[PDB]
Amino acid sequence: PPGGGEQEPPPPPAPQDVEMKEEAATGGGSTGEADGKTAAAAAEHSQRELDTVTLEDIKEPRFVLRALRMLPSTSRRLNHYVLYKAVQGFFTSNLPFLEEPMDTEADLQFRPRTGKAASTPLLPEVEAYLQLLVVIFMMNSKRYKEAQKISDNRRALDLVAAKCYYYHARVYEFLDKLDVVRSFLHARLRTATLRHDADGQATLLNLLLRNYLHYSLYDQAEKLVSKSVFPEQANNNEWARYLYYTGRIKAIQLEYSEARRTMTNALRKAPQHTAVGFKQTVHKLLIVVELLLGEIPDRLQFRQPSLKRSLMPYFLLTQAVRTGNLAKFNQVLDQFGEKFQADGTYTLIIRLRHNVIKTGVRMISLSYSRISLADIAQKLQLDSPEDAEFIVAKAIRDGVIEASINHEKGYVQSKEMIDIYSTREPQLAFHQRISFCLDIHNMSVKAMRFPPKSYNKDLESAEERREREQQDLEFAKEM
Amino acid sequence: IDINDVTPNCRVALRNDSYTLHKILPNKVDPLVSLMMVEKVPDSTYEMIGG
Amino acid sequence: DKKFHGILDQGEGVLIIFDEPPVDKTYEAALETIQNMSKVVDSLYNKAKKLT
Amino acid sequence: MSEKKQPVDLGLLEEDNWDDDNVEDDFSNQLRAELEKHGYKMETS
Amino acid sequence: GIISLLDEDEPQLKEFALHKLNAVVNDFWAEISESVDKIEVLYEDEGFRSRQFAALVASKVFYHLGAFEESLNYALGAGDLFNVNDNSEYVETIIAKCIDHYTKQCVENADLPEGEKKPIDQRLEGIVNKMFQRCLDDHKYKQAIGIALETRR
Amino acid sequence: DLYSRYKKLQQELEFLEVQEEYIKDEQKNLKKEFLHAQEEVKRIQSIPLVIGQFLEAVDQNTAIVGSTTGSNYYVRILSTIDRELLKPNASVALHKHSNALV
Amino acid sequence: PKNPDLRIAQLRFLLSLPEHRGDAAVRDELMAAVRDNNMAPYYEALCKSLDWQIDVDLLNKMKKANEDELKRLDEELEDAEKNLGESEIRDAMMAKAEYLCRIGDKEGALTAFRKTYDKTVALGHRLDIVFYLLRIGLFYMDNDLITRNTEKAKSLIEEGGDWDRRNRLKVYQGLYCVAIRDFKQAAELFLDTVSTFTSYELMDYKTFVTYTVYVSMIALERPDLREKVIKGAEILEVLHSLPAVRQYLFSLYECRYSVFFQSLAVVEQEMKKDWLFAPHYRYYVREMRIHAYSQLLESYRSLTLGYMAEAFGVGVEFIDQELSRFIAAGRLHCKIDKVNEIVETNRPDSKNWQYQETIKKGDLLLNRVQKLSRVINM
Amino acid sequence: YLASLIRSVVALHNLINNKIANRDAEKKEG
Secondary structure, three states, rough: HHHHHOOOOOHEEEEEHHHHHHHHHHHHHHHHOOOOOOOOOHHHHHHHHHHHHHHHOOHHHHHHHOOOHHHHHHHHHHHHHHHHEEEEHOOOOOOOOHHHHOOOOOOOOOHHHHHEEEEEEEEHHHHOOOOOOOOHHHHHHHHHHHHHHHOOOOOOOHHHHHHHHHHHHHHHHHHOOOOOHHHHHHHHHHOOOEEEEOOOOOHHHHHHHHHOOOOOOOOHHHHOOOHHHHHOOOOOHHHHHHHHHHHHHHHHOOOOHHHHHHHHHHHHHHOOOOOHHHHHHHHHHHHHHHHHHHOOOOOOOOOOOHHHHOOHHHHHHHHHHHHHOOOHHHHHHHHHHHHHHHHOOHHHHHHHHHHHHHHHHHHHHHHHHEEEHHHHHHOOOOOOOHHHHHHHHHHHHOOOOOOOEEEOOOEEOOOOOOOOOOOOHHHHHHHHHHHHHHHHHHHHHHOOOOOOOOOOOOOOOOHHHHHHHHHHHHHHHHO | HHHOOOOOOOOOEOOOOOOOOOOOOOOOOOOHHHHHHHHHOOOOOOOOHOO | OOOOOEEOOEEEOEEEEEEEEEEEOOHHHHHOOOOOOHHHHHHHHHHHHOOO | OOOOOOOOOOOOOOOOOOOOOHHHHHHOOOOHHHHHHHHHHOOOO | OOOHHHHHHHHHHHHHHHHHHHHHHHHHHHHOOOOHHHHHHHHHOOOOOOHHHHHHHHHHHHHHHHHHHHHHHHHHHHHHHHOOOOOOOOHHHHHHHHHHHHHHHEEEEEEEOOOOOOOOOOOHHHHHHHHHHHHHHHHOOOHHHHHHHHOEE | OOOOOOOOHHHHHHHHHHHHHHHHHHHHHHHHHHHHHHHHHOOOOOOOOOEEEEEEEOOOOEEEEEEEEOOOOEEEEEEHHHHOOOOOOOOOEOOOOOOOOO | OOOOOOHHHHHHHHHHOOOOOOOOOHHHHHHHHHHHHOOOHHHHHHHOOOOOOOOOOHHHHHHHHHHHHHHHHHHHHHHHOOOOOHHHHHHHHHHHHHHHHHHOHHHHHHHHHHHOOOOOOHHHHHHHHHHHHHHHHHOOHHHHHHHHHHHHHHHHHHHOOOOOEEEEEEEHHHHHHOOOOOEEEEEEEHOOOOOOOOOOOOOOOHHHHHHHHHHHHHHHHHHHHHHHHOOOOHHHHHHHOOHOOOOOOOHHHHHHHHHHHHHHHHHHHHHHHHOOOHHHHHHHHHHHHHHHHOOOOOOOOOOOOHHHHHHHOOHHHHHHHHHHHHHOOOOOOOEEEOOOOOEEOOOOOOOOOHHHHHHHHHHHHHHHHHHHHHHOOO | EEEEHHHHHHHHHHHHHHHHHHHHHHHHOO
């Protein structure tokens, strides 16, 4: 009894108090602001929702019996908060928290408000240990939310519901089927994108793609023809994961040129927060695909504390691939195949042999000028000299090297191509970035004039000084 | 212009037509500073002392 | 010792002598200006990122 | 403000002012010392 | 996809395939758009029995694709299958764009109705006046009294 | 009413975008005229003008000068001159009548 | 104070990287720490070293001696308050902040120094404070400290000649520059061989000579070499007592490549275990070797590789693979043919090289400025 | 190339100045 009298009492009052201005005041201001004005995003308090989600994530009977049927009930809500606090201080409070929104005069008269209120129970119920709020009961609460979803008037409800049917997906993600979630999402997508433009063409796309790939079906038809590619309103958080998904989709189909740029943009759109969960994966792929595309080094050495422990296999891998040796590649694959399979990346790196052999032959071509093929096999350990002829021939085909070969003799001789400065390519190289440096100036200037505003102050010299000047001039002209 | 701001030995603008106070110019030079500039004694400190 | 620039042949003893154009002033100024603006940009952190 | 959250798979179970060059780690594969190679190669011939 | 067996000639097998496709199109509109031209081939064959049915599924596809002109063409082609007007957003948006196309063409002909018009589809003015009558019976006469101007009739 | 909700919206859509046109033309004409007004201010720099010494600047576009007549004045300066050439004791020219730095 | 303590830091490193070296250092460092009341550098180092169970008595008596000294110092503070000169409290606190630094941690010493910097009205004592900060930063490798203190010292040194102080700053800046892999800057700032006193950071003038010749091997080319480091008798007379470095330099100058490699191996072995050279001791080596090749290939044009075996080191395949991996890197412009075992040379113009670095530095700066562009404006 | 680079960085500095000159003044109206 003595132990629980000094640290247990504090938990009750202080969190309630600091919540009274965190979500109670937030709800009160949103009701008269989001549902009281057309500021939308401004008075929608999506960042207040954000903060009250992130803080409560790492953080109900009183707040569920909120009443606002009449003005006295709405006024009462706030004194009833203190009344329930006093009851909690004196007495011990408590399914029976789902019928209250239909009772206790609960007439918010704003869907934007009752939605967030309902979702707030769902988030704790989702995070109620691993119980899943008695499983389907959380889903049933979200089934209630889905009934609310069909309620209507979306000058706020839309951007309120986004988060709702984003956690809704997580509910099934942690449990049972997802196929019928896909059916629902497909329907909901055209339920939107038809009410002119309403957004959600960002969140629903990511929700659909999150486990479309996880089920391991690489359908792409609708992605190339999707009209929701361009919501243009993503808060710079949705856009990153959307670009990541489309980049992996593009890269898995033997397309490397565009995936690098799009997914590098996606990675560099990532925020500054300490969490590095998805950045681990995007980095890992962003350097596998760069190894695949030609032989760009990618070895922009990463030793940051967060990423150091994870990417230890990959460092060893790049070490083998950069050199022309091939036994090292097998000695790495047979060692880390299971680890790569656990990462879902065995299929991409299993086709890396061609890149290794291209690097080796290019290095051999650049180093020597006249070498017998009776040693190329020994240096690259192909175990046979005759097929080295075919390998070199294929290399010459694609313009890898311009060396000729005397088949009757056996030695390979290479041409000499120097003085690239006179070639037209450096002009192209300069132009490609002249374009960028000209674009950035216009981009910067475009947004400079937005902050200058409220400059109504426009006065020249005076108002009544003109009469004094005229009088002085007349007096001077009189004499 | 307020009375309490018009201290002795201050530089002031003057309108030409009627000779009225208009501004208060920055300041002037204190005479003792000028005298010390004329004299030019070589400043020193304790680090330049021997025995 | 760079007093005389050419090349020596051991096969038969022929002293090939050639000359080269003046090393250009073209690029070292570009190099220094690039590093100078890099330093300016680096110094721009102390007034751009910290304040915002 | 500072929402900064991502849903899945946080992992990993929780300097140098010289610009990095790849070559430094290449011979980190072996040849610990030029010394050792020269000393233990020259003796043969 | 089951569209493979659309290459068979037998009309009974086509009437199996189409009656799966029209039931599942909502979830595969892009993958079927890959080949909808074949359904237009079935619509072209006047010899084909149940010809009208292909028009409906084609309209659903092009509606999902946003090709609303083509959707309206094949909605008219499917004709009396649009006796349903009362529920799906599909028909609601199609009849709305029908209203729009009709009024814009009527405004164009407000210069001259004899002005070498493209012949009016009786289905078009049919469904438009049917929806006008619907508005009359709903007692929502304040709509009709306005729309009467934009038909230029 | 519900029909006016269409007509008025059409009318505002019509009225807007004509607001765009005059502002678009006006910004064009403004600089055209501003160049002429910029070079019109050099009437002041006429031929007979006295010579003085710059002393200090109390603030922007105002300074203290000393004429060679033998008296000090607190006067205005002209805008278009370069502000990077007013050294501590440089030589300047003043209007003969107004005694304004030119 | 911190005049003798530099070597201690060395020993710390000598016990970190050398695993085999764990016998004598742990003892000489131990009884160097037991005296002088050095309490700081073995809070965690005691964990790094052995358990050393028998320390609680020593720990207690040593920390109580520390407390006795500190309370004495407070006593003189209050004594100086009543009858003060230039606030002799501040004189005493400046005079004993170095004691606290010698015994305690960074926080107390740094705070005491930053507070006592305001009492001194003369430049000499300010410079002494700044030099104390440089020294502690060199101990604990605090880069921003080094940079700010160096720029403050340079901004304080132009008032008055202080050419001895200027030379001291030059040596400090050279020491910082060797730690970073900047070598040309070191060789330029290590040309103070006629103004380096028997300093407190390099016990041996001869060690200073060895460092400067080592860096001058890389930084500068043949005319300057042959003109400055071989014609300056002030270092020739010192080198006369150092046969190893003398022959190491002469081997490179006189083209006796056979004796060059043993000396190079000895040097790199010695500098592997030396401080402020280990972190990149391999890099250095991989320069000299390639440099040697560039000292021989430009005189001839069609030299056979067999000549190398009896002129540079036995082993045809070794030279073959070495040249191959050096050609692949983009340096040492030449070419080799195996069917006839011949080595040819080429003369690329000094334009293409003057182009690649331009384009790549432009790329990196553009990337950086793009990051700046998007990080601002939401 | 070089000139366009310099132009861009100057315009960037100008934008930074404008924005900080706004956010530290707008708060004065409460």
